[PDB]
């Protein structure tokens, strides 16, 4: 049985490992299929327990990963691709 | 620099901790506001790398969390709510 303060703390806006499809990070590369099709990135998630407050990053950094670029029925090559990651998060008023 | 096999293994359909809004797990309780408004649950996620294949659970358990049920402008109480969790996942045709 998870105690209130545990859930509360563990659930509040922070960077959490998040599985993100590569195509949505790189919309312009539809001639390709990627393996993997998604990557594990640290991204702001959780609740602000508040409302039109939103859980946004205030500190970012890049990370470079080895992804298979595949041209379907023609070939495949493992290249380096770069992705955004979230270092700090914070609940901020919206627009 | 994250190596190919690291990424592939770590991205493929498993249970991962996932922040889920309570309202969506209990859409009938609109009178209430919850604190926290979301919970950390093990849920299937990631890529099947394949296509109309789909990352679904094949094994579940319930977990019970202490959550604050708030009746706006009237009162607040900590009660217990149960949430579905995901122990194993698999890539299945849709």
């Amino acid at each position, epitope marked *: 049985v998870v105690k209130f303060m545990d859930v509360y703390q563990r659930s509040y806006c922070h960077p959490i490992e998040t599985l993100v499809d590569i195509f949505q990070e790189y919309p312009d590369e539809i001639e390709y299929i990627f393996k993997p099709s998604c990557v594990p990135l640290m991204r702001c998630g959780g609740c602000c327990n508040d409302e039109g407050l939103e859980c946004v990053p205030t500190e970012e950094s890049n990370i470079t990963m080895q992804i298979m670029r595949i041209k379907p029925h023609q070939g*495949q090559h493992i290249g380096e691709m770069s992705f955004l990651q979230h270092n700090k998060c914070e609940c901020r008023p919206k627009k | 620099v994250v190596k190919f096999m690291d990424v592939y293994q770590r991205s*493929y359909c498993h249970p991962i901790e996932t922040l889920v809004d309570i309202f969506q797990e209990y859409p009938d309780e609109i009178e209430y506001i919850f604190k926290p408004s979301c919970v950390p649950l093990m849920r299937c996620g990631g890529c099947c790398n394949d296509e109309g294949l789909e990352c679904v659970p094949t094994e579940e358990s319930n977990i019970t969390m202490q959550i604050m049920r708030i009746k706006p402008h009237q009162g607040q109480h900590i009660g217990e709510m149960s949430f579905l969790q995901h122990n194993k996942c698999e890539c299945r045709p849709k």
Partner: antibody
Framework: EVQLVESGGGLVQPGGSLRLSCAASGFTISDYWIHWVRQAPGKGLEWVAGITPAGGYTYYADSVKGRFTISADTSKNTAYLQMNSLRAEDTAVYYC?????????????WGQGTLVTVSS | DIQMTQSPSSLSASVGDRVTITCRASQDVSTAVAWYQQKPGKAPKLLIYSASFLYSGVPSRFSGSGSGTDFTLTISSLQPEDFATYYCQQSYTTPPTFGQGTKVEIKR
């Protein structure tokens, strides 16, 4: 010309070990996964070992788990199948083969086979 | 734990005959199937990948079709050189397996 050149089979004692080489030329092996398929005398193709696409984990046939281990030296552009404590029923022609994504889930180049015969 | 059952186990067909080998996976596997021809003692050769696609180099009289559990190698017009053992293989859900094979001889 792309091809896969195996070697290193032949005659072994029961309980002995062997390691097969699968040397790639005309392409770079780190961009692929090399699977191993074998075939006993007058029997069908049995899949042996290889990194599988569901989970990316090296997987081994039940009949072989814990004795066979694939490795790879990408500076030699070669892959290996280390075979340990060989049982008589390992006697087969072993093929290595190029597992591919771009021709989905297919094996497009194969080595010529090496006879591995297990007998005292 | 998945299986692949080819039909028939073996057949004789005259030069010119339409030949159909079927292949029935006990579980669903999309179009993630290939067919390989293997001439006696020699390394298997890729005929068909992703269920219906013809590997480049292979003669047009080979075709593949199907998804789910039921799959079909067709040879529209059998040549004398086509005698071999034909295999289906699945490599998409673990474990990867082959069918038992279908030995084709030429009837004359």
């Amino acid at each position: 010309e792309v091809q896969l050149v195996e070697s290193g089979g032949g005659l072994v004692q029961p309980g002995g070990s062997l390691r097969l080489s699968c040397a790639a030329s005309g392409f770079t092996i780190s961009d692929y996964w090399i699977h191993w398929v074998r075939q006993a005398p007058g029997k069908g193709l049995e899949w042996v070992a290889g990194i599988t696409p569901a989970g990316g984990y090296t997987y081994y046939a039940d009949s072989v788990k814990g004795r066979f281990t694939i490795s790879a030296d990408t500076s030699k552009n070669t892959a290996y199948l280390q075979m340990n404590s060989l049982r008589a029923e390992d006697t087969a022609v072993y093929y290595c083969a190029r597992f591919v994504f771009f021709l989905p889930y297919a094996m497009d180049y194969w080595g010529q086979g090496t006879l591995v015969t297990v007998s005292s | 734990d998945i299986q692949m059952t080819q039909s028939p186990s073996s057949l004789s067909a005259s030069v010119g005959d339409r030949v159909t080998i079927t292949c029935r996976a006990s579980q669903d596997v999309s179009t993630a199937v290939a067919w390989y021809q293997q001439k006696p003692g020699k390394a298997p050769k890729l005929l068909i990948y992703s269920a219906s696609f013809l590997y480049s180099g292979v003669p047009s009289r080979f075709s593949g079709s199907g998804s789910g559990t039921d799959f079909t190698l067709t040879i529209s017009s059998l040549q004398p050189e086509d005698f071999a053992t034909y295999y289906c293989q699945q490599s998409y859900t673990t474990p990867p397996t082959f069918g038992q094979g279908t030995k084709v001889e030429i009837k004359r």
